[PDB]
Amino acid sequence: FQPTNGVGYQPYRVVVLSFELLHAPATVCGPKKSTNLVKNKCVNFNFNG
């Protein structure tokens, strides 16, 4: 690995993400954006499902 090496021979950092889902509940999920809360008004609420 040298500065003058060809692009094919230049170093490349490789990061592979693999996602495995077995017969078990899933822990790693995406973020769940939440809206602001309003009091003293008739609203349709959803708290933790």
């Binding site: 077995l22 017969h23 078990a24 509940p25 822990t27």
Partner: peptide, 22 residues
């Protein structure tokens, strides 16, 4: 092949362990 990992007389320590749908 791991599928999980978590890290955090005088005493009566009672415990109840159970499994429901995994």
């Amino acid at each position: 092949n791991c599928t999980f990992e978590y890290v955090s007389f005088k005493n009566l320590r009672e415990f109840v362990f159970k499994n429901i749908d995994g």
